[PDB]
Amino acid sequence: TTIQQNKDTLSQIVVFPTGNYDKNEANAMVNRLANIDGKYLNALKQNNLKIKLLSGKLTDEKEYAYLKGVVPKGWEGTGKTWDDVPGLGGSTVALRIGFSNKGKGHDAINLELHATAHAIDHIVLNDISKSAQFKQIFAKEGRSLGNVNFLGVYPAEFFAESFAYYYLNQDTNSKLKSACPQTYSFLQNLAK
């Protein structure tokens, strides 16, 4: 099955932490990532993009120590810094095990899909969220998924959250189709 293939592809991309961690939940996070279209996963593998699962704070990792005390873009006024943020995506991907669900230090529909969508946007699709095509779709529908002061202002964030809705499960996929039809069709064609 395609999901099995995607899980095999992910076995070459996911990095598990050393020490004690929740192995069952880490597997659950991988299983949810396996719903992403294989074309994107294969491209992540080809670019040697690693999806790092973490048992501690992001900024405890050497490569993110420079973000200690830094307030993420769009997080102004939350009183939180990258030290408190459970996931990160872009040129890399890093995710705290156990914080997948909405409300676990974030309000994304799913942490690992949102973060990985950033890496797909930036690495695989050469920042398509900044393209003129997407900006026109973002201008119309970017305030239709809630969190309008964040998703409605940053097209890369609207892309990542829409991507997460599309691939998390059938319920969120349907919700995106109803709320953001042009975005839905855009993602549908993106995978062709």
């Binding site: 997080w75 939180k80 943020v85 996931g87 990160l88 995506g89 040129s91 309000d107 994304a108 950033h118």
Partner: peptide, 7 residues
Amino acid sequence: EVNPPVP
């Protein structure tokens, strides 16, 4: 580049 989740 780095991007956070939804606050």
